[PDB]
């Protein structure tokens, strides 16, 4: 969701 | 040279501003959708925070997710209690510069009971005298002090990297050493200290939980990202599924 695709970047 | 403490200062986050318009009367919903915004912010800056910490990435990539995010609050409350000490002498809770709450807007805000233990744990740093480098020691320790019941994906890692932020907090502690009633006194006040972060994250979670919920119906806006962690995460907590390693009993 939103949260691991800001841990992404 | 002091290696641990050297990267714990040269990752230390920087001032984050939550953009409140200070000029505007305050309101309930002015206030908690500045805090909100904040939120996010200060989020954003304890991912990269995290993913620097000595050993971090030694937990499976999903670990790293779930303690930042179960550990979120409580590492949001302890820095916000620093930042109050050494800039206003816990007089007033400084959020952020554009975000300095008062008496009335802690009651504005409807978290007056939240803010009031909050400018205790604050005081705490004065009464105890906490240098900088136990703060930081401690507020790394916090990222690792709440877990699922059920355990992690790779425990044992976790289990390994908290003990060793233990040792370095032992190693770091202030005192005149030819006498341990200062030391083995001083761990057992910082890790009461440490404690007493864990009920006040957890009735910010209940009020934040409970604020997103009635959310539209009081005009409150959550970023879409906080949005997901209260309703994802945020409920393990308060449902006694992931709870806090506490020093004391
Ligand atoms: C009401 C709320 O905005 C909720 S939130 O930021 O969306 C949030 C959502 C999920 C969490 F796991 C933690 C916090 C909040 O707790 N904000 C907030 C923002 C900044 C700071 C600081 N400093 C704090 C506090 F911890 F210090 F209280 C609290």
């Known amino acids: 969701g939103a949260f691991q695709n800001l841990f992404q970047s | ?249």
């Open chain 2, 1 to 249: 040279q002091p290696i641990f403490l050297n990267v714990l200062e040269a990752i230390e986050p920087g001032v984050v501003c939550a953009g409140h318009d200070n000029n505007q009367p305050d309101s309930f919903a002015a206030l908690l959708s500045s805090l909100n915004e904040l939120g996010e912010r200060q989020l954003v800056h304890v991912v990269k925070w995290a993913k620097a910490l000595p050993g971090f990435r030694n937990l499976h990539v999903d670990d790293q997710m779930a303690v930042i995010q179960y550990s979120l609050m409580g590492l949001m409350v302890f820095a916000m209690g620093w930042r109050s000490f050494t800039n206003v002498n816990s007089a007033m809770l400084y959020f952020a510069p554009d975000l300095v709450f008062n008496e009335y807007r802690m009651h504005k805000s409807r978290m007056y009971s939240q803010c009031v233990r909050m400018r205790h744990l604050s005081q705490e740093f004065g009464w105890l005298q906490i240098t900088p480098q136990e703060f930081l020691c401690m507020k790394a320790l916090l990222l690792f002090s709440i877990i699922p019941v059920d355990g992690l994906k790779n425990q044992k890692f976790f289990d390994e990297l908290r003990m060793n932020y233990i040792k370095e907090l032992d190693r770091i502690i202030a005192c005149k050493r030819k006498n341990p009633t200062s030391c083995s006194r001083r761990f057992y006040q910082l890790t009461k200290l440490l404690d007493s972060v864990q009920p006040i994250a957890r009735e910010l979670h209940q009020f934040t939980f409970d604020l997103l919920i009635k959310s539209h119906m009081v005009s409150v806006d959550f970023p879409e990202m906080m949005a997901e962690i209260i309703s994802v995460q945020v409920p393990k907590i308060l449902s006694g599924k992931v709870k806090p390693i506490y020093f004391h009993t």
